[PDB]
Amino acid sequence: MITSAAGIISLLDEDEPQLKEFALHKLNAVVNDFWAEISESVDKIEVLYEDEGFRSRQFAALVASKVFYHLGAFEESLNYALGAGDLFNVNDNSEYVETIIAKCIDHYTKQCVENADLPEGEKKPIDQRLEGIVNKMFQRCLDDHKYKQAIGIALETRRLDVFEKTILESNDVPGMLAYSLKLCMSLMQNKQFRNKVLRVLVKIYMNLEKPDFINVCQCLIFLDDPQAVSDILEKLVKEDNLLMAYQICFDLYESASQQFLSSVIQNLRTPKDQTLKMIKILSGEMAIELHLQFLIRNNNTDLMILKNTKDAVRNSVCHTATVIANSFMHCGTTSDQFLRDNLEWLARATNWAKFTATASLGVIHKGHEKEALQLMATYSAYQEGGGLYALGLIHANHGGDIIDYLLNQLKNASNDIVRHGGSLGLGLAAMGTARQDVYDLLKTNLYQDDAVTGEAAGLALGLVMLGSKNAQAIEDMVGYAQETQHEKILRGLAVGIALVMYGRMEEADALIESLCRDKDPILRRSGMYTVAMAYCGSGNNKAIRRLLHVAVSDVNDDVRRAAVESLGFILFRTPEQCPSVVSLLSESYNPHVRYGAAMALGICCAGTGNKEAINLLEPMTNDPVNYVRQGALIASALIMIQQTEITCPKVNQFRQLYSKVINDKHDDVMAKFGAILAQGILDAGGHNVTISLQSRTGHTHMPSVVGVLVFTQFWFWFPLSHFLSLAYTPTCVIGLNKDLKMPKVQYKSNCKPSTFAYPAPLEPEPNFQLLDNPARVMPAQLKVLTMPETCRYQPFKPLSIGGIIILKDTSE
Amino acid sequence: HGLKGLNSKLLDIRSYLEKVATGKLPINHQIIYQLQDVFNLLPDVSLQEFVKAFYLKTNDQMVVV
Amino acid sequence: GLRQYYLSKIEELQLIVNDKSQNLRRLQAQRNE
Amino acid sequence: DDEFEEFPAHVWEDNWDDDNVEDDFSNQLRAELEKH
Amino acid sequence: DLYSRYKKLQQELEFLEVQEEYIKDEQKNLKK
Amino acid sequence: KRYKEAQKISDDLMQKISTQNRRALDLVAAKCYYYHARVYEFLDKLDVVRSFLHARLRTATLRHDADGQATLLNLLLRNYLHYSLYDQAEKLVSKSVFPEQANNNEWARYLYYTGRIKAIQLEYSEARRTMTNALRKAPQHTAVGFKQTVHKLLIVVELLLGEIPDRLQFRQPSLKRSLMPYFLLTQAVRTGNLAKFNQVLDQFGEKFQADGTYTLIIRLRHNVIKTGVRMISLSYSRISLADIAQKLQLDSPEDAEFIVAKAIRDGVIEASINHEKGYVQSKEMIDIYSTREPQLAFHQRISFCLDIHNMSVKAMRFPP
């Protein structure tokens, strides 16, 4: 064909404009092949473009951009495409246009993020024309109706304006809002940008005919801002939307933090009956009595297996093992069988066994606030301290006047054991609720240097000041740790310093680096646990980098184990992720490394019943080491919590394995201990409760996380294992009416009542099941759950959400 | 580590020299003698024989590697 | 159109994931060995 | 694995020693001695 | 949808890089 | 041999591949491109191939394919060469970056192309090194036609530069038939007798053009004297200008001065000249070992070996 552009390019040199424009046109026509020669002769085309007197600025820029595209520059090509003005076509959907649009998009997103952080400085020119191309693509995509894609590109660019415009002028605002909420909760990383998008979404929600104040308050909780939720609630009160307010308050109690709830409480305190009901609900009073009655009316517990265990029990080790397992079985139930029956068998245990027995009693009567200070009228120094500890567990996270009473007693404590127990109990009672007087009493007891009292002091300090990160107390604890010579107190301070600073996801680099470069192995462990508490559920790749590197390179096996367990805590919001790392680890040299891998898997799949996790646990159990098998057992039980055979076809295998090991000879005492705790786990709480770190709202549960961590910290002190009462999450749904009582109405599951029935105590099959307002509803066995065709009461909140639902009632 | 040690030592000697130059302590002709002995002992690299030998033997080292 | 651009992006990212994951597989073999 | 179809188609090792010269020496030495 | 999977791919590719460095460091420690 | 339905079917396949944007499809795409190009070449049209090929090459560069990129580059280069678009192709190659991870076959083709380019473009040293590398990387078992072509081009470029290429190639079994005329040529030049040189050109011009050489034949018409002076320099240190002139039969012993000076320009020989008494001083060779360049060569090869080791340990495969 033309075979050479030499003639045309040489002709373009001439001043004659008409000639110049026609040469430009023909060059644009034949650019695709002779881009090389055009490259050689760009200079003159650059002159032609830049000298704006010539009325072919756009064409010159377009041809130059195409040429530089063919070359591969892709940057000066981009600028020339930008300078082509509007002459560039966008709907031609050619390769060149498409790729230049891609380059525009990515470059613009880069400057967007750059400025995104930059407070005001830099404010790159963002060539308003580049803004023009991105906007044009926005409208083209809107025309094609790619609302998802418009929304996401807006998010990436940070263009909240375009995001809101597309979502509002989408095809279905509610579904779009749900999708955006999911993306914000999961994929978004930058805290500030995430909060901005949350605010925009909240405003969009408010801008609805019937604003979904559920989502509004959920996003507000993610945003902190108790004032906004308080004002919304007061406005709803004026609106008389009592049911809507009830549902919002229950969601708030389930998800938000005590500080947030208290702020909102005082803001509201700033008709009166409705206000009082809101206040009571937000405090959660009777919001636990509901669960209490729920378990009482559903306390399916096969105590025959525990009779088998107590026949198999010989050593005091397994004696306490079974005590703990029975406490787990019963969970928060007023009914106690062994304690009121096997009195002599209880007496057979003493020393650091009376303490754990009384603690088990507390766990069993969990939450029974009504007779507290009179229930303990039933039950030496060990039993006295255990009574204090059990009272604390009863008031676990519920800080009534029992905090003051425990403060008074611990002050009037004249024994190391009494001091330790009262310290534990008061720390539990005031967990999170950093109170200066309580912190002071703990500081005094801690300074009364003593291993017994010191461990409890450290734990209680961490609990009390949890997530509240007072640099004062931080330095105090670090100094006392570095100066006191009692490895026991040192462990207590390790857990305390990890706990104190639960929040502050990223605001931990200083202290974390200090601890991780510290001297003592116990303080390195403290640092790893502090990282866990800081980055709970964040999936922060930097945090995991640190944790795996240390867990693999450190010289102390204890801290290696702790670090892997921290990895486990961090990766829970992405269960599928953890298996790979925990596998490569679990198959380790260092048996503590293998144990840590097992426990990390347990944390990862707590309440989830993963299949691959059990696939990986089974080879571990039956390992040539004692504690490794113990951990394998406990992790498997944790995973299979509240699971059946059909849902997970290995629960039988592992239950039989537990039974065999307990009724075996040549396994180790601690192996039986692990098996007993595994049974207690699996069938904990009338087999009606589960363990999930994050609330049903996808919201991390601080009490659950702290409970699981402390429990995992039993290697060095058995009495701590009772903390799983905290993580015990009632697996129930309650339909509550405006009268604040259960209405005698039934729920229905459109599924086989064979895949989700209680385990068999030790019509072929329908696809329907029925239940009552107190409803054991497992996570997987919650989505399918539905209210029957018609009833007096209807679910004001979607039932597939789960949890506690308010029921709008018909005429009567 | 050896480089770090040498650097620290020469930092020390420089500090002492500064003290003497400021007159914070008396001149020690012996310590001087030693210092100018050191400097007198410093080598010459751009000697055009040293360099040829250096290249030659570096060539042998690289050959074996 | 947009779908074309993001389809490309996914294509390159998936190529990278492929090669890096198989490298990870080799390293896992080494480590387990 | 490939063939480049596009491109179609005294037992010892010696250099250009051929060099089309006469008797290596006989003539050379005879003439040289005659001159010398 | 498409961007959900795109960002998931981002996450997992990054995490896989993290796996690479994990295994290299651990291989060194295991040689030691 | 039915290249009407065949070309249409190939075009249909090309539509399929263009539509189908799957990575793994890359290699099959490259082969399809090769074969479509071959059939169109047999049809003796190309051109449409140039355009479509070019579009595909840009596509396969935008998507980071290597084997396809190199293959298509080779095809398009050969297309330019067939119609003798040498200078345009020169710009193309200079402005286009060849991929490193390309098959021995592709590198061999690309190196041959670049070698012919630069040889015509009067860069003989690059011609030699590149084509020698191409021949080294080419398979030995087969591809006799490719071997013959590469040998012919290397022979001519080396002869122009002065080096008389070894007799090993001429005695190679699969080459002597294809190279009689080149052997006659090398004999003629080494003799330095334009009579037999030009009569050899007369007898074997037809195949000479058939390969495409006459330009290079005239380049030799020149470099005969260059090679003569090269060997003269190699066999002397202080020879006289008049002596070299009479040795080369170059009348008017100042033409000899100019010739040797041009040789110095080119770099064929390294010798100063002093017209004051009329003599050429060969540059005194230096102990290169007493330098850094041996270190440089060894560093290059060290990097080479370490890279090979690293890529192998990458290539390790392990079952699950």
Coordinates of N, CA and C in Angstrom, one line a residue, chain F residues 10-86:
Chain F
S10 N -8.7 -20.0 7.2 CA -7.7 -19.4 8.1 C -8.3 -18.1 8.6
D11 N -8.9 -17.3 7.7 CA -9.5 -16.0 8.1 C -10.6 -16.3 9.1
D12 N -11.4 -17.3 8.9 CA -12.4 -17.6 9.9 C -11.8 -17.9 11.2
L13 N -10.7 -18.8 11.2 CA -10.0 -19.0 12.5 C -9.5 -17.8 13.1
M14 N -9.1 -16.8 12.3 CA -8.5 -15.6 12.8 C -9.6 -14.8 13.5
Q15 N -10.8 -14.8 12.9 CA -12.0 -14.2 13.6 C -12.2 -14.9 14.9
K16 N -12.1 -16.2 14.9 CA -12.3 -16.9 16.2 C -11.3 -16.4 17.2
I17 N -10.1 -16.4 16.9 CA -9.0 -16.1 17.8 C -9.2 -14.6 18.3
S18 N -9.4 -13.7 17.4 CA -9.6 -12.3 17.7 C -10.8 -12.2 18.7
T19 N -11.9 -12.9 18.5 CA -13.0 -12.8 19.4 C -12.6 -13.4 20.8
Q20 N -11.8 -14.5 20.8 CA -11.6 -15.3 22.0 C -10.3 -14.7 22.7
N21 N -10.6 -13.9 23.8 CA -9.6 -13.3 24.5 C -9.2 -14.1 25.8
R22 N -8.6 -15.2 25.5 CA -8.2 -16.1 26.6 C -6.7 -16.2 26.6
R23 N -6.0 -16.1 27.7 CA -4.6 -16.1 27.8 C -4.0 -17.4 27.1
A24 N -4.3 -18.6 27.8 CA -3.8 -19.8 27.3 C -3.9 -20.0 25.8
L25 N -5.0 -19.4 25.2 CA -5.2 -19.3 23.8 C -4.0 -18.6 23.1
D26 N -3.1 -18.0 23.8 CA -2.1 -17.2 23.2 C -1.2 -18.0 22.3
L27 N -0.7 -19.2 22.7 CA 0.2 -19.9 21.9 C -0.5 -20.4 20.7
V28 N -1.7 -21.0 20.8 CA -2.4 -21.4 19.6 C -2.6 -20.2 18.7
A29 N -2.9 -19.0 19.2 CA -3.0 -17.8 18.4 C -1.7 -17.6 17.6
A30 N -0.6 -17.7 18.3 CA 0.7 -17.4 17.6 C 0.9 -18.4 16.5
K31 N 0.6 -19.7 16.7 CA 0.8 -20.7 15.6 C -0.2 -20.4 14.5
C32 N -1.5 -20.1 14.8 CA -2.4 -19.8 13.8 C -1.9 -18.6 13.0
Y33 N -1.4 -17.6 13.6 CA -0.8 -16.4 12.9 C 0.3 -16.8 12.0
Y34 N 1.2 -17.7 12.5 CA 2.3 -18.2 11.7 C 1.7 -18.8 10.4
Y35 N 0.7 -19.7 10.5 CA 0.3 -20.5 9.4 C -0.5 -19.7 8.4
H36 N -1.4 -18.8 8.9 CA -2.1 -17.9 8.1 C -1.1 -17.1 7.3
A37 N -0.1 -16.6 7.9 CA 0.9 -15.8 7.3 C 1.6 -16.6 6.2
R38 N 1.9 -17.9 6.5 CA 2.6 -18.7 5.5 C 1.7 -18.9 4.3
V39 N 0.4 -19.2 4.4 CA -0.4 -19.4 3.3 C -0.6 -18.1 2.5
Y40 N -0.7 -17.0 3.1 CA -0.8 -15.7 2.4 C 0.5 -15.5 1.6
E41 N 1.6 -15.8 2.3 CA 2.9 -15.7 1.6 C 2.9 -16.5 0.3
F42 N 2.5 -17.8 0.4 CA 2.5 -18.6 -0.8 C 1.6 -18.0 -1.8
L43 N 0.4 -17.4 -1.4 CA -0.4 -16.7 -2.4 C 0.3 -15.5 -2.9
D44 N 1.4 -15.0 -2.2 CA 2.3 -14.0 -2.7 C 1.6 -12.6 -2.7
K45 N 0.8 -12.4 -1.7 CA 0.0 -11.1 -1.5 C 0.4 -10.3 -0.3
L46 N 0.4 -10.9 0.9 CA 0.8 -10.3 2.1 C -0.1 -9.0 2.2
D47 N 0.5 -7.9 2.7 CA -0.2 -6.6 2.7 C -1.4 -6.6 3.7
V48 N -2.4 -7.3 3.3 CA -3.5 -7.4 4.2 C -3.0 -8.1 5.5
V49 N -2.1 -9.1 5.3 CA -1.4 -9.7 6.4 C -0.6 -8.6 7.2
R50 N 0.1 -7.7 6.5 CA 0.8 -6.7 7.2 C -0.1 -6.0 8.1
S51 N -1.3 -5.5 7.6 CA -2.2 -4.7 8.4 C -2.7 -5.5 9.6
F52 N -3.3 -6.7 9.3 CA -4.0 -7.5 10.4 C -2.9 -8.0 11.4
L53 N -1.8 -8.5 10.9 CA -0.7 -8.9 11.7 C -0.3 -7.7 12.6
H54 N -0.2 -6.5 12.1 CA 0.2 -5.4 12.9 C -0.8 -5.1 14.0
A55 N -2.1 -5.2 13.7 CA -3.1 -5.0 14.7 C -2.9 -6.1 15.8
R56 N -2.7 -7.3 15.4 CA -2.6 -8.4 16.4 C -1.3 -8.2 17.2
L57 N -0.2 -7.7 16.6 CA 1.0 -7.5 17.4 C 0.8 -6.5 18.4
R58 N 0.1 -5.4 18.1 CA -0.1 -4.3 19.1 C -1.0 -4.9 20.2
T59 N -2.0 -5.7 19.8 CA -2.9 -6.3 20.8 C -2.1 -7.2 21.8
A60 N -1.2 -8.0 21.2 CA -0.4 -8.9 22.0 C 0.7 -8.2 22.8
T61 N 1.0 -7.0 22.4 CA 1.9 -6.2 23.3 C 1.1 -5.5 24.4
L62 N -0.1 -5.0 24.1 CA -0.9 -4.5 25.1 C -1.2 -5.5 26.2
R63 N -1.6 -6.7 25.8 CA -1.6 -7.9 26.7 C -0.3 -8.5 26.7
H64 N 0.3 -8.7 27.8 CA 1.8 -8.9 27.9 C 2.1 -10.3 27.5
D65 N 1.9 -10.7 26.3 CA 2.4 -12.0 25.7 C 3.8 -11.8 25.2
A66 N 4.6 -12.9 25.4 CA 5.9 -12.9 24.9 C 6.2 -13.7 23.7
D67 N 5.8 -15.0 23.7 CA 6.0 -15.9 22.6 C 5.2 -15.4 21.4
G68 N 3.9 -15.0 21.5 CA 3.2 -14.5 20.4 C 3.8 -13.2 20.0
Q69 N 4.2 -12.3 20.9 CA 4.8 -11.0 20.5 C 6.0 -11.3 19.6
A70 N 6.9 -12.1 20.0 CA 8.1 -12.4 19.2 C 7.7 -13.0 17.9
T71 N 6.9 -14.0 17.9 CA 6.5 -14.7 16.7 C 5.9 -13.7 15.7
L72 N 5.0 -12.9 16.1 CA 4.3 -11.9 15.2 C 5.3 -10.9 14.7
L73 N 6.2 -10.5 15.6 CA 7.3 -9.6 15.2 C 8.1 -10.2 14.1
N74 N 8.5 -11.5 14.2 CA 9.2 -12.1 13.2 C 8.5 -12.2 11.9
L75 N 7.2 -12.5 12.0 CA 6.4 -12.6 10.7 C 6.4 -11.3 10.0
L76 N 6.1 -10.2 10.8 CA 5.9 -8.9 10.2 C 7.3 -8.4 9.6
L77 N 8.4 -8.7 10.3 CA 9.7 -8.4 9.8 C 9.9 -9.1 8.5
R78 N 9.6 -10.3 8.4 CA 9.8 -11.1 7.1 C 9.0 -10.5 6.1
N79 N 7.7 -10.1 6.4 CA 6.9 -9.5 5.4 C 7.5 -8.2 4.9
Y80 N 8.0 -7.3 5.7 CA 8.7 -6.2 5.2 C 9.9 -6.5 4.4
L81 N 10.7 -7.5 4.8 CA 11.8 -7.9 4.0 C 11.5 -8.4 2.6
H82 N 10.4 -9.2 2.5 CA 10.1 -9.8 1.2 C 9.9 -8.7 0.2
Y83 N 9.2 -7.7 0.5 CA 9.0 -6.5 -0.4 C 10.1 -5.5 -0.3
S84 N 11.1 -5.8 0.6 CA 12.4 -5.0 0.7 C 12.1 -3.7 1.3
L85 N 11.2 -3.6 2.3 CA 11.0 -2.4 3.0 C 12.0 -2.3 4.1
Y86 N 13.3 -2.3 3.7 CA 14.4 -2.5 4.7 C 14.4 -1.3 5.7

